[PDB]
């Protein structure tokens, strides 16, 4: 029985070594999770955890900042009380209690290869609590390998523990309501070459339970244009091993008011250092998407499409306005062939790339996952000695341990010669954006090309309020937000050639703010852009990287307030659900001088006609308390300059 508390002392962790390995956590004196155990079996028979034989133990204490580039501030704050337990076996487990949360993770200092058959990462509740989880999207219920293949795209159901469905996988980060204005947000970080962690209510009461992807034996290609390799055949075990080494970190998050949980860092600070030196190249910014608009573009003397003079118009576009980036989506490559190699007849990519070259614009190459990883090294090379600044690949949908190995290979592959990366159809960042800073964004979120389909019934404005506290706590989300279409309650259709939000125009516009993203989406066609001067020049400007960051305040799933830093100037977002608000910002966060404010707050009749607002300028200082009301879905954008 050993314990380990928080810097502050009001969270603790209390582990006992007996039959089993298990660990509860406390919160200001009130157990909020009850003994839990966790261990991992290997194929030879071993369980790290049954009647386990300590050998050992190390205490520490760490105060430090870790540097965090293109993120939410310059440096993030690490600190904690470290317990390690050693182990006889050859086998760790390290334990740390930030004030915001409690962590551990196994470690393999054994020599000898073997593999891993399953683990067990159980989560027991003192009650029947409400839980918000996302769903596995697809597969059928009891049929656990028909869920592995997925995208990690879906909202969140809140209901209590006792009520959830016991067949269906939760993948990560999920949330628990421990009551009394606390939570707790389970995640893991530093999830490479390991399977990723799904949660179950198929075990005992008031328990989230742990399972894994089987090891992939036979894949075969196929898939959305065959571009995707489906796992066949899988293995009687979930990850090989055969050298020293850390497993993936089992975060706990635990916080008193929920802008704690929007604001904590442990998922970077968990994630492996970075393996980078020089960052110098790496560019964050904008982009002038195409897709989610469906290069539906008005006003031209041309046929849009996937062609030379559509893409030009783009690279326009964002020029005009110093957005820096313009991705040529799925339609590039010849459909079917998976084949990077082979552009269709109506684009010329070297003319392309040199043209956006002379107009300040980088181009970003979409690519299918098969088609990307089959030839990567020569793909990576080929494109990059051409001009191209990165690549969006698509279309993994798992998270076994090969796939997941792939995401630290492509990050590495494009480091290696300079090109940025934006996953997609994948999984929760988990800490790899620290150890490869190259990879921009990740996708896994219910992004606005929902709305390109999704009936009604898809609340994305109550979506919007709930991934601040859930899903963006492993990292950057590729959201893709923008939209000048904007519909109040009631008023939205699925409509694939000219979407539309849910909501308010400054809930879009709030959204640069509230939302991270360093590879950053203006998802509507430079048409409807150019028609709204006010909004664009507002995204435009707006830095997608951050030296500060301060959550001001929210409630999970109801409204939220963030204010960030860039250099000396200051940017506030704020979003509400669909219930009107009023919200005060009060901006002591500001420095001494005089300020000039810029402010996008919803109109008198953003209830009725969602693309309503209004643009106001007044000086405001640090003892400033501005009022602001946010219409239905709605929400407002602020600029401190
Ligand atoms: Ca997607």
Aim: charged fraction near 25%; hydrophobic fraction near 35%.
């Amino acid at each position: 029985r050993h314990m380990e508390l928080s810097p502050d002392g009001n969270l603790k962790t209390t582990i006992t070594i007996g039959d089993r390995l298990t660990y509860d956590i406390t919160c200001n004196g009130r157990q909020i999770l009850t003994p839990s155990p966790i261990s991992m079996t290997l194929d030879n028979g071993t369980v790290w955890g049954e009647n386990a034989k300590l050998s050992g133990t190390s205490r520490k204490s760490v105060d430090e900042m870790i540097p965090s580039p293109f993120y939410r501030a310059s440096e993030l704050r690490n600190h904690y009380n470290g317990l390690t337990l050693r182990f006889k076996k050859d086998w760790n487990v390290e334990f740390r209690a930030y004030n915001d949360g409690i962590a551990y993770r196994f470690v393999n200092q054994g020599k000898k290869p073997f593999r891993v058959v399953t683990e067990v990462s159980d989560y027991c509740f003192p009650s029947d609590m409400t839980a918000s989880v996302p769903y596995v999207k697809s597969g059928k219920d009891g049929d656990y390998n028909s869920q592995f293949f997925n995208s990690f795209e879906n909202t969140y159901t809140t209901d209590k523990l006792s009520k959830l469905n016991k067949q269906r996988l939760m993948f990560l980060p999920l949330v628990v309501d421990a009551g009394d204005g606390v939570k707790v947000c389970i995640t893991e970080s530093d999830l490479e070459n390991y399977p990723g962690l799904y949660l179950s209510a198929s075990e005992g009461a008031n328990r989230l339970s742990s399972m894994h992807a089987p090891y992939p034996k036979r894949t075969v290609q196929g898939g959305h244009n065959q571009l995707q390799m489906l796992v066949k055949e899988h293995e009687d075990y979930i990850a090989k091993v055969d050298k020293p080494r850390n497993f993936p970190w089992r975060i706990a998050v635990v916080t008193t008011t929920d802008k704690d949980l929007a604001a904590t860092n442990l998922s970077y600070l968990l994630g492996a250092p970075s393996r980078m030196s020089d960052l110098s190249w790496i560019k964050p910014g904008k982009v002038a998407w195409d897709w989610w608009n469906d290069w539906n573009l008005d006003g031209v003397d041309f046929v849009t499409g996937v062609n030379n003079p559509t893409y030009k118009a783009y690279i326009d576009f964002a020029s005009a306005n110093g957005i820096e980036y313009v991705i040529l989506d799925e339609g590039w490559a010849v459909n079917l062939q998976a084949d990077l190699m082979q552009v269709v007849k109506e684009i010329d990519l070297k003319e392309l790339v040199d043209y956006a070259a002379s107009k300040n614009v980088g181009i970003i190459l979409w690519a299918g996952y098969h088609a990307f990883e089959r030839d990567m090294e020569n793909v990576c090379r080929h494109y990059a000695e051409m001009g191209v600044k990165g690549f969006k690949v698509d279309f993994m949908d798992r998270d076994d341990q090969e796939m997941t190995a792939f995401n630290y290979r492509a990050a590495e592959m494009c480091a290696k010669y300079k090109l940025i990366l934006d996953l997609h159809g994948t999984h929760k960042p988990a800490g790899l954006n620290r150890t490869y800073p190259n990879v921009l964004n990740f996708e896994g979120v219910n992004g606005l090309e929902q709305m390109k389909w999704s009936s009604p019934s898809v609340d994305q404005v109550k979506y919007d309020v709930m991934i601040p506290f859930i899903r963006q706590v492993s990292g950057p989300m590729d959201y893709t937000q923008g939209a000048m279409r904007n519909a109040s309650k009631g008023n939205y259709y699925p409509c694939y050639s000219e979407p539309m939000s849910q909501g308010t125009r400054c809930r879009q516009l709030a959204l640069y703010v509230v939302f991270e993203s360093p590879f950053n989406m203006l998802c509507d066609t430079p048409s409807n852009y150019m028609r709204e001067p006010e909004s664009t020049a507002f995204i435009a400007e707006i830095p997608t990287v951050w030296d500060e960051s301060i959550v001001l305040d929210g409630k999970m799933g109801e409204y939220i307030v963030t204010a960030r830093r860039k250099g000396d100037v200051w940017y506030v977002g704020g979003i509400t659900d669909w219930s009107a608000r009023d919200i005060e910002v009060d901006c002591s966060f500001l420095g001494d001088k005089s300020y000039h404010a810029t402010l996008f707050k919803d109109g008198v009749n953003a209830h009725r006609a969602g693309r309503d607002y209004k643009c106001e300028s007044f000086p405001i200082k640090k003892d400033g308390k501005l009022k602001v009301h946010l219409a239905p879905g709605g929400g407002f954008a602020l600029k401190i300059k």
